[model samples]
Target: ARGYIVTDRDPLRPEEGRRLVEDVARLLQVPSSAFADVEVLGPAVTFKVSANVQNVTTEDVEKATVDNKDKLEETSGLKILQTGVGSK
Candidate 1:
């Protein structure tokens, strides 16, 4: 299997950063344990969150779902979009 990496950014809010990490982890079918690091390499205010998936494929996202879709929407204040590599 080949590894895949995915990165995304939201506003500078800490909660947004954290959520992006968790969401990517789930979408990639990787354990949260894999997200052992979060680096803020930008303006002291701005931020970016990323993840590294080992032995996983981009196709995994096609089968991923938010563990608690409703709760995630409520907590993040962002409508959960079912996104994936091959999702229409």
Candidate 2:
């Protein structure tokens, strides 16, 4: 919602991308505005956690996705994909 969605290859449908962001934002306990540059790739999704987001760390993103990967895949309709996290 707050991030830029990459549409270069159309790895994900626009609606699905929104779902993915919403899910991750909720997972991180942050508003959708806490993300930036969300790239929905064919085999992965990558995004920067906004520098303004507090308390949540990059490692937290890694662990949350690692722990509940299936949920994300189901929500986004992407499989075995990586969630690349960085600071904005």
Candidate 3:
């Protein structure tokens, strides 16, 4: 259960959005193509991200995410207000 990213100077730029997908994909050990809808909303940054890796599991995503929380925030220069994961 995971979803895509939603982006800004400080606004969510396509560059940042690209980096985000790359970063997360690295963590998930999949090609960046597996991700979609990566965007950042504000300075306090409300973003949404989704992945569709054929073999990757939600447990893997969440684990990599929480484990890399600092890296994500530092690299993106955004504050994560919340996190969630679900499936269709």
Candidate 4:
């Protein structure tokens, strides 16, 4: 690596950051109805979107939820639940 020194610069433009949040939501397959506040926390680069997941999922969603739940366990630290009436 070349010796490089850097000062704090702006991370991304506002429009760019807005687009990125949508991109992440779509990539994560977040419910289209989900709404969130996207924050470019530090230097407008890194971000987190505190989303509110819709309480209303669908019939097929229940089936997929367990598969999703199982998948998340294998990788991410979070474990989700399908506490619905007929959860798979």
Candidate 5:
């Protein structure tokens, strides 16, 4: 199983996007290749996450977001406006 992970930045920066993925991969104990498919569009960075593990729910995402809140805001120059959980 797999899903998409969308990361948006105020000012387009590939390095920031890369760092975000790296940080996420580290915290999740997954390889960066797990999110190999990435698309950078101006202020948005979208990627595909290969589900190599389970129990990744919305709460998990929120927890990750909260855990990396400071770095996200510092690197992307954008605050986490809001977060919503949904299925696609």
Candidate 6:
């Protein structure tokens, strides 16, 4: 139900990809993983949450996302390159 629209200035290499996942996963605070396909956007590393949102309520999903987003951006200086909601 939720996904990522990652975009970067340069190509996301293996280390970069792992770093992306690790850094995001660290701030995710969830008990499980939130891995998603790094859908290439000419280096965007776009990936869907592909989980969690399925079992949670809409409000919960939104809350977690915003909270994580703010914390992530503040703590990691990572911005959500983009957002995709067309599927929903």
Most lDDT-accurate candidate:
2
The better-scoring model by TM-score among 1 and 3 is: 3
Alpha-carbon error at 79 in model 1, in Å?
12
- Which digits, one per residue and each the tens of the lDDT, describe model 3 over residues 29-62? 7877666545554422222334464576556655
After superposition of all CA atoms, the RMSD between model 5 and the true structure is 4.1
Q: lDDT at 44 for candidate 5? A: 54
Among these predicted structures, which one has the highest TM-score? 2
Ranking 1 against 6 by lDDT, winner? 6
The lDDT for every candidate, in the order shown, is 0.43, 0.61, 0.57, 0.36, 0.57, 0.49
Q: Per-residue lDDT for 1-88 in model 1, tens only?
A: 2221222333335556456546656655677566544433221112222244466434443233345556545555565444333222
Winner on lDDT between 1 and 2 is: 2
Worst 10 residues of 2 by lDDT: 1-10
Question: TM-scores for all candidates?
Answer: 0.36, 0.63, 0.56, 0.33, 0.57, 0.47
lDDT of 5 by residue, 1-88 (tens): 2222354545647776666666666666767776756555565555556656654443564567677777767755665543333366
Name model 1 segments beyond 4 Å from true. Answer: 1-11, 41-54, 57-88
Off by over 4 Å in 2: 1-10, 52-54, 74-78, 84-88
Estimate the Cα RMSD of every predicted model relative to the unseen true structure.
8.0, 5.2, 4.5, 14.8, 4.1, 4.3
Candidates 2 and 3, the one with greater TM-score: 2
lDDT of 4 by residue, 1-88 (tens): 1111111324445554455434334445765345234344333323222334544333333334344544533443332322122222
In angstroms, the error of model 2 at 15 is 3.5
In terms of TM-score, how similar is model 5 to the real structure?
0.57
Candidate 6: tens digits of C-alpha lDDT, residues 1-88? 4444354545645555545545565555532355555454454444445456345332343445556666655654456555443255
